[PDB]
């Protein structure tokens, strides 16, 4: 179930469908018992990598290990 054409390192179904969550540096399906945990939901694209035109791509931007001076509301893609 990994038919992502662009090689942006994620579930293409979780790209197109309901969402996902970066957790433990890995891509898990969005459970609806995650808001009380403090996690959020992100929605992205599969047909291209840099879905916001940032110089950082999707897996670089969700898992915040890319620049620690970035304000945290700029973490969702």
């Amino acid at each position: 179930d990994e038919d992502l054409d662009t090689d942006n390192d994620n579930i293409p179904d979780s790209y197109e469908r309901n969402g996902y969550t970066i957790k433990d540096l890995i891509a898990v399906k969005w459970e609806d018992s995650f808001a009380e945990q403090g996690y959020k939901k992100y929605v992205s694209n599969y047909l291209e990598s840099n879905t916001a035109g940032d110089p950082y791509t999707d897996y670089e931007k969700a898992s915040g290990s890319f620049d620690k001076a970035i304000k945290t509301e700029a973490r969702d893609p």
Partner: protein, 97 residues
């Protein structure tokens, strides 16, 4: 300065400028002022907002113990046989802190 595999170090193109801002996004700034000297350190912190991060955290007494090389002597803290307690010094906070 940084040493490569060749056994020497190289200092070229390694700016300290693009390591300024990152540290000042994550750290708390603690300064000490004695009678002749002064020391400014940055100690790393732990965000409580987002739950994915795992940074080990401590308290301000343990922070002054870890930042400076501070010896725990009999409950007190000592820095070069100078006592630093919660009562034998003078603390200064800015208004937000």
């Amino acid at each position: 300065g940084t040493k490569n595999s060749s056994g020497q170090i190289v200092t070229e193109g390694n700016s300290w400028s693009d390591y300024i801002s990152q540290i000042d996004s994550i750290s708390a700034s603690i300064i000490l002022d004695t009678e002749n000297e002064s020391y400014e350190r940055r100690v790393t912190a732990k965000n409580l907002q987002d739950p994915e991060d795992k940074t080990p955290e401590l308290t301000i007494g343990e922070a002054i113990e870890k930042a400076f090389g501070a010896t725990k002597k009999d409950g007190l803290l000592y820095f070069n046989d100078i006592p630093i307690d919660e009562s034998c010094v003078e603390l200064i906070f800015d208004d937000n802190t």
